[PDB]
Symmetry: C2
């Protein structure tokens, strides 16, 4: 209860504590000033865009559905934006202090503590704002208006029949989705255009030094390392977390009228509240793990993760047993082992998540065989390097997907679709620690950008941050896959109609693949996924060229130009993501859109895994060859040329395309779930 | 009866192919070193063919015996027949191209008959296409005449249950085995051949980047002879194998849909299920795809011969379009006549969903035909720099940016053909339900004879380009054949698009067939609408979709890994044979995985999971195929433009030219092995799933 406020205050306390850390060096202070100025300008531009789009969409939701939906949309927008702003400011401020600690104390410990404190500020802001928004929505709308009390399908002034509370939580999830969409897409385009331009100025005719303070592109690359790995990745994790919670709530809410009432109101109310309490326990357990951690940084991060996971396991076992022991109609909704069944699913998801990270690591890291084969092959041709990286990513897609399939099967066997959503929530129970670790990465990147012994210590922490960022990217992709699957489940429950309640519940819960509509929608969704990825790449290249032209021709000016180009190019993919469900449905019904959702989820998950793993393998092979474990091949060799080309191709892919894809899948699912009440029946063909 | 005339049409196609073979035999072939080179290529290719043919004969005999064990022996016999017919078509086309390669260059150079040499090369492609179509339809008609009519498998038309719990229609299972045979042979051909051809092209570029400096597509490299052997193996044989595989899949799926529609439509009156559709109507709907295919073959032959003797279009691509358009329109009109007669003899139109009666499947057919044409157009529009696409590729060439833009261009090109195909699906459904969806599938490849003709023309032009580069009589001598090679690359992309569109329609019909095979006598008592149900909500189905998409990407990646390993590894003829044998050995594994995945996934999780696996495989394979084909074609077409130097006089020596060559060599394995292997994967997985459903829907562990 009010645990999110504790997270917000504890995040603010770590902000105040780290501000009291000396900034030391003057050149480093100036670099942090440049990064802060550029990041704040980018914030101003994106916040103007987000304000306009969010107000428009909130008014639209208020028009077509109940006003509570639009209010929750705005609330989610505000909460996610606040979390992102607080975390990004923390990260921009903490890098120089981390460097100062590492330099003065000649030790990695104080620097590690300050960097992890900044990461914790970001993660705590995420969790606290998200869960505080959830609690405010529940307290204001569910109880004061009695939407949960009557728990009846409402018909608004446009003749749209729908569940008010489900539509409101759908709008709140849509707000999280819109914030994550703008953050990840625009920011990632910025981040990879900036890193690409930083590498390009090294290779231009003017030979402006790469990773140079006078280079505007190095400052843009640092700002992007912050914006991408913090705002976009944390936004993705919060979007998947909120999607899972909202999916559980929607599943219970629509199971109430479907099972006829075969399930009492008390059971439905408890199943709606269970993810909320389960989410709160995850936040508390995550903070406990963080507090314990605050010579091996990876060991400390792993300890934080495992403590958070195990504490969640035990406390949620107790909560789930004590709270769901007193409900009726558990078997009808799929609780095989009774009240213990959802908790089981949750822990399963937890394990799935951790395992997924390993697989990402197993393919992305150069310590293991996959990236060693890539580095060894690099002696034989740039094209062969590109082919081997593509093959490695395509091979890497399989093991995490197999893990996800096994987790889905186990969660289903335990507790139906409700426990599938609970397993998603279990995977995201330690999302606070996940966001903290992930936002650690870019602080280390910036510190690296900022004695040879202190340099090597900063390099050590930067490499640890890179590895953790790759692991977090894999984790985010897996969590987004679970969230999209649960959102599809919620959409298909939303397929319910007043005429359908008389029909068998199994007959209602029905999407035949044999339908040409379903098959064609799956095809179209997969095609739109690939077309989205292609236009992402084109936009990134265009933005990089525009920045290079401006540089040839004011660091804030160049950042503003890049931000404006990214925002202008973001409209078309955002338009596609928003309009595909609406247009496809108002033309063909809801079965076509369900097929679209299935195909989009499949294609986006697969491409995201592929791109993330390939880029991670390429970057780690670069580091492998630089450290020289491939004996007899020094810097400047043909393998280095091949790896540089491979990284320039892959880095933008792994850091914007795949995350954009999983944001795409989740937002398309959310928009379909929201619009179903209209466009199931208002369809042209 | 007139059926004798229909049976004679494939025989006429075979005879005309033999006549064109006699035409190519009259090759002067003045050049001696190039003739010896082609003889060496023929010897190596035939040795590889003998080795792979022995291995695939072993595997095919094993699989046929397995079919005889688990299901009817007619299934294995039809599988063996399809193996023989497809192998014969591939061999005939290969011999035709190998004989024609030197002849085209000889005519164009010595006799200055560049145009006539082009015409004879397209005639060789037509020989391959006629062999493909004639052998496929001859096998189909022999199967139908022997088993459906003589043995009374259609006459009794009753579901039989053998041991192991397999319930099935004997004739439907026989045609399923014949389609599975075409799929297995096409798999062995394409996977290994594509690995070999792209390893050979990559190895030629490696000799460019070895201690020597003799690159790929390069006259100075004699290692390119292995690349030429590949230009035949796969770039000729595999396109016909894939198109025949999709063609047979569409026809067999239509036949299965019609055959299982007979027991499905039953109405419970007085505790007795009355067959809602008569036997005569079902038999007519089973025979109709065969007559439509025969009419399509006849129209294709008429159009091809008419174009050869009517007008020498100065644009070879325009001439190919003229041939395609004539064949398409003739097929449309004659199928109008056929379907009007069937509508005159049909009465169960509303119960089966025929809005316009038998004309509605005809509509669907036309839809598919036009759809295919449009798809091809789109392919060109994105792969060729005639419009802004691939022009921006050259602008980017003006290296990492180039690679990124090529990837983006391929992914952009994915969307329009898929949108056109979705519109075609919607229209075919609206006309005539799933039966007309299958009819549109068959319509798209109704002119598959002309399609294979054009596509197999392509690599003959590629070989002529290599020979012209070797001759070095003039850069214009090289460029005349490079023009034809670029046309061939565009046609290969068009053929891949046709194959994937037909595969998508056929896979839709195969989902229908899978759920039809789910029928049991209890399901016959149960409502057909309730039976026809594969819920997406189901965790099994959704997880299966995820797994199928993952297997699609992992298959592509392991293909790339095997090709790269072969390139890393490499008597020069002995070395080529060793590389080819290693490629076949590594081809063995993914095929085994593809065959075993449906069986294992089902015996673990039911039939819903396997249906989901099929869904995911269809989606991912189709999308990747479109992507790879378009991207590779765009890269190669931009190469041609920069080589001619119309890009501001940069010339060969420009560093961006080297970067673009490297990018094109990267793209080649994708466009020439990944996507077509994926669509064959999709259809073979669907076929084996539909076969195994009868057991493993109810004999499942979890
Ligand atoms: Mg070549
Ligand atoms: Mg060549
Ligand atoms: Mg060639
Ligand atoms: Mg090639």
């Amino acid at each position: 209860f009010l645990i999110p406020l504790v997270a917000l205050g504890f995040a603010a306390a770590n902000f105040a504590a780290v501000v009291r850390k000396p900034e030391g060096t003057e050149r480093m202070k100036e670099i942090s000033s440049y990064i802060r100025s550029g990041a704040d300008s980018f914030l101003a531009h994106e916040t103007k865009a987000i304000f306009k789009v969010a107000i428009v969409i909130a008014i639209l939701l208020m028009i077509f559905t109940t006003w509570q939906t639009g209010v929750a949309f705005l609330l989610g927008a505000v909460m996610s934006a606040s979390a992102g702003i607080v975390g990004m400011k923390m990260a921009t401020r903490a890098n120089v202090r981390v460097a100062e600690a590492a330099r003065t104390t000649k030790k990695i410990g104080p620097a590690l503590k300050v960097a992890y404190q900044g990461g914790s500020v970001m993660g705590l802001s995420v969790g606290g704002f998200a869960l505080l928004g959830l609690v405010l929505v529940y307290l204001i709308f569910g109880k004061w208006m009695g939407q949960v009390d009557n728990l009846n399908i409402y018909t608004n002034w446009l003749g749209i029949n729908f569940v008010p509370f489900a539509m409101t939580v759908s709008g709140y999830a849509l707000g999280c989705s819109i914030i994550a969409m703008f953050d990840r897409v625009g920011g990632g385009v910025y981040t990879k255009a900036a890193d690409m331009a930083a590498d390009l100025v090294g290779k231009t005719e003017l030979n402006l030094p790469e990773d140079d303070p006078r280079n505007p592109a190095t400052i843009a690359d640092n700002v992007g390392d912050n914006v991408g790995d913090v705002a976009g990745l944390g936004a993705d994790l919060l979007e998947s977390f909120v999607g899972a919670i909202v999916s559980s709530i929607i599943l219970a809410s629509y199971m109430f009228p479907i099972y006829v009432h075969q399930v009492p109101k008390e059971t439905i109310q408890a199943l709606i509240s269970y993810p909320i309490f389960f989410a709160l326990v995850g936040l508390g357990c995550s903070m406990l793990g963080i507090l314990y951690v605050i010579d091996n940084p990876q060991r400390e991060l792993n300890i934080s993760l495992w403590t958070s996971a195990l504490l969640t396991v035990v406390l949620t076992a107790f909560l789930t047993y004590f709270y769901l022991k007193d409900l009726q109609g558990l078997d009808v909704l799929g609780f095989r082992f009774g009240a213990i069944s959802p908790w089981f699913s949750a822990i399963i998801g937890i394990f799935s998540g951790i395992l997924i990270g390993f697989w990402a690591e197993y393919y992305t890291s150069y310590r293991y065989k996959p990236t060693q084969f890539l580095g060894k092959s690099s002696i034989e041709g740039t094209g062969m390097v590109i082919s081997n990286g593509l093959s490695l990513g395509m091979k890497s897609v399989f093991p995490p997907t197999l893990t996800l399939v096994l987790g889905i099967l186990f969660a289903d066997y335990f507790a139906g679709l409700y426990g599938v959503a609970i397993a998603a929530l279990g995977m995201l129970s330690f999302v606070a620690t996940s966001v903290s670790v992930d936002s650690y990465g870019p602080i280390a990147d910036n510190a690296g950008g900022i004695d040879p012994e202190v340099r090597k210590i900063t390099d050590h922490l930067d490499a640890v941050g890179n590895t953790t960022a790759a692991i977090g990217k894999g984790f985010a992709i897996g969590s987004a896959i679970f969230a999209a699957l649960s959102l599809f489940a919620s959409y298909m429950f939303s397929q319910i109609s007043p005429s359908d309640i008389g029909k068998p519940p199994s007959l209602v819960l029905l999407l035949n693949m044999l339908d040409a509509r379903v098959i064609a929608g799956a095809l179209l969704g997969a095609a739109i996924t690939y077309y989205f990825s292609g236009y992402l790449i084109s936009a990134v290249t265009k933005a990089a060229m525009k920045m290079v032209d401006e540089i040839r021709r004011d660091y804030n000016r160049c950042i503003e130009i890049t931000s404006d180009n990214a925002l202008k190019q973001m409209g078309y993919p955002a338009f596609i993501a928003i309009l595909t469900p609406l247009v496809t449905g108002f033309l063909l019904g809801a079965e076509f859109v369900g097929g679209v959702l299935i195909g989009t989820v499949l294609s986006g998950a697969m491409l995201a895994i592929l791109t993330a793993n390939s880029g991670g393998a390429w970057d780690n092979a670069k580091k492998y060859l630089e450290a020289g474990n491939l004996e007899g091949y020094g810097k400047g060799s043909e393998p280095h040329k091949a790896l540089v080309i491979g990284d320039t191709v892959g880095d933008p892919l792994k850091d914007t395309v795949g995350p954009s894809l999983d944001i795409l899948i989740k937002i398309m699912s959310v928009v379909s779930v929201i619009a179903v009440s209209i466009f199931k029946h208002v369809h042209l063909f």
